[PDB]
Amino acid sequence: MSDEWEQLTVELRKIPRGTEAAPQYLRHLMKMFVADFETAVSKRFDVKFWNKLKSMMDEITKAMENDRLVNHNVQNLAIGFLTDLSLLVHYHYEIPNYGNDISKQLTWTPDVFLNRKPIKSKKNSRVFMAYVLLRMGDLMRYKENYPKAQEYYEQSCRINPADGAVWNQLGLISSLGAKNLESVYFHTRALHATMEFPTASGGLTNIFKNFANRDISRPMPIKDLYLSCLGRIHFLLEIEDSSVHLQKIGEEAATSKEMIVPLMSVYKHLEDGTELEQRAVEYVKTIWCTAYRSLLKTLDDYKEESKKLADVPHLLHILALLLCAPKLLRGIEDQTEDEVTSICEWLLCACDEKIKDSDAFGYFHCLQRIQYPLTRTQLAQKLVEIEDED
C-alpha cells in the first residue's frame, strides 16, 4: 500500500479501545473509507465498523441494566452512523445502482453528486452495499420494525447471497413471525452458504427440539408434520406411523424448496453408517423418492398440456436439487424411466439455455456438484445419468 494509507493505518491503530472511545474510531474509519474505498473494502473495514458499533450498543445496553431509554438512544445513534457511512461512500465513489426498491436514504440519486472516483472492481461495491443493507436490517430488527428489517434483509440477500449471515437473519425474522418452516429453510441456507454461517446450526437445532416430540399420530397441518418428522430424523428417533406420514410429506415436498433444501442438509450430515443412521437415512429415502415421483408426474403433465418451459423454472430447480442425491434414487429407476425419457426429450429440444433460479442456488454448497447457472442441457444430462446407472 501507499504511504498515505499506511499513515492513516497507524493513526487508526493508535486509537484506544473501549465503549467511550469508539465514535472516534468510527469517524476515522469513515475517513479511511473516503480516502480509499477500494482498499477499505479489501480489508473489510465495513466489518470493523459494524464491530465497533455493535460493541458500543452491547456494552451500553449491558452497563445500564437493559434500560429502554438508553437502548433507543444508542440504537438511533447507530442508525445515524451507518446511514452516514453509506452516504459518505456514495458521495465520493460511483456506486452502481442495485435496485430502486432500495431505500434512498442510504442511496440518494446520481443527480446530487459531482465528481466521483470511478469504481475499479465491482465485487467491492457489491459486498459493501450488501453488508450495509444487512446491518441496517439488524438495526431495524433491534428497533422492532420487522417489515423494514425484512426489506433490508431481502435486498441484502439479493445483492450478495454468498453471505450466510443474511440468510440467518432472514431466519430470525421468520422465527419472529412464527413462521417455523421458512425459518428452518433460511437457517439451512445460512448453514450451507458460500460464506457458511455456522451459528445457524444451533438455531436449526433449537427448532428441531421444539418439534421432534410432538404427537405425530394426532392431527396437524402438513408443514408442522414435516417439521416434527425432520426433527425425528435429525435426533435419530423412530417415526411413529412412518408409511402414511412419510408418503404425504414427500407428496407435499415435491413442490417446496423449503422442505427439500433442509432435507439435503440433514441427509449430508447423517450420510454415514450406524444402527440408527441407517434407519434415518431410509426415512429420508422414502420422503425423497416420493417427492421425486410426484414431481416427475407433475412435470410430465406440464409437458402434456404444452406449458412453456420458462413457465416452470422453480419446479425444474427442485428437480435438479432432487438429483443431487443419486444414491437415494436407486431402486426406482425402472419405474420412472419413461417419464424421465419424455422430460429429457422436452429439455433437449427448445426457450434458451438458462433457468432463472432467483432462489440463488450455486451460492448453496450443500451436496452440490452441479455447475451453475442451470443449463437447459445440463439438467437433461443429469437425469440421463441418474437413469443410466442401472
Place this chain on the structure above:
Amino acid sequence: QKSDEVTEKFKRYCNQLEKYGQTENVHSPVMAMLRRKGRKQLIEIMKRDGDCTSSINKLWIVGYYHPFQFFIRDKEKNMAIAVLLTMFCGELQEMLSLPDDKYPALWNMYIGDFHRYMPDEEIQKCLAVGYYSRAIDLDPNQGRAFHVLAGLRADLNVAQKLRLMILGQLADAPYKKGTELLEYLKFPQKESTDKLMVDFVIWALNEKSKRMDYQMTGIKIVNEFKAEIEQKLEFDWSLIMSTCRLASKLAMKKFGFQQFYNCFDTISTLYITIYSRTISSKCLLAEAISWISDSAEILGHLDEQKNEPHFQKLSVFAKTKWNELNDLVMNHINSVFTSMSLTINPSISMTSFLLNGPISEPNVEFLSQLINYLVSVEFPPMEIIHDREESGPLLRRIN
C-alpha cells in the same frame, strides 16, 4: 373524535418540550421521551391531508433546534457535538424511512441542517451539501435549500452561485425576502464577464425606479455584452446565459410582463449575437432551448387585463427578432441532430442540470427531453416532422 385526541396530545407534548427545554440537559430522558411521543403523534398527523408544516416546524424547533442551541452554550459536556448531531440524524431518519411520508424534502433539509451544524474538518459535514441537494430533488419549491447550497458549496462559479440564490427566490416557497441576493450583488467581481453578468442581474431585478435611466443603462449593458462576446476569444457563455434566464424569470415573477420583456429583449439579442459568431460550444444549446421554452411559455399566458395572450402585445421588430432567434436555434438543433434521432419517454431527471447548470455537455436523451418539452408548449415555435428522409427533424410553426 380521534382527531381531537391526537391534536391535544401533540400540542401538549410540544408545549412541554418548549417548557422543559430551558431547564434540563440535552440528554434528559424526559426530553427524549417527549421527542419520541411528539414524532409518534406527528406521524398520524402527516397521515391526514393538509399543509401541516407548522406542526413539523413546531416539533423541529422546540424539540431539536432549541436543545442543540442550549447544548452549545455549555462547557460541561464531555460528548463531541458531532456525535450528538449524528444521534439526532438517526433519530430523524425514522420519518424518511417510514413509507407514505408527505414531506421528504423537509426532513432531508433538517438532517442537512444537522450536518451543517457540525464543526469544520469533520468528515460527516460533507453530506450536508448532499442532503440539501436531495431535498431539491424531492421538491424544487424549497428555496432555503437553494440558498444554503449557494452558501456551502466550494466548487462553484459566480454564475452557479447566482443561479442557486435566484432559484432560491424563484421557488414557490422562497427563502425569506431576498435581501441576501442583493447584498451579494453589491459585491464586485474580479473578471469582466462576471461583472457583466452581475450588471444584468441588478438591472433585471431593479424596480421601475429611474424609468428612462433604466432604458439607457440597459442599452449600455447590451453594448458591453456584445463587445465582450466579440472581443473574448471563446468561452462557454451557457453559465451566464443560464443565470440571465433565471434572473429574467425572477423579474417576471417579481413585477410584470413588461419588466420581463426588457430582459427578454436583451437576452434574445445576446443569443442572436453568440449564434452569429457561429461558435458552437456544446453546452450553450441546452440552455438556448430552455430559454426558448420558458419565453414561449410566458408569451403564451394571457395578460392580467385579459382578452389577449402576452405574445400579441409585441412589436413587429420584436416578433422579427424572436423568429430570427428561433430560426437560429432550430438550425443548430437540426445541425446536431443528423442521424441522432428521437428518444421517446426519456424520463431524465432535471435535478443535476438545475443544481449545477450546463457544464456537462449534454447527451442525446437529455436534449430529447427538452426538445419534447418545447413542442409541448401551448404555442410551439417548432414541431417535429412526421417523417423525415434525412434532415429537418423540427420545422418552424406558429410564426
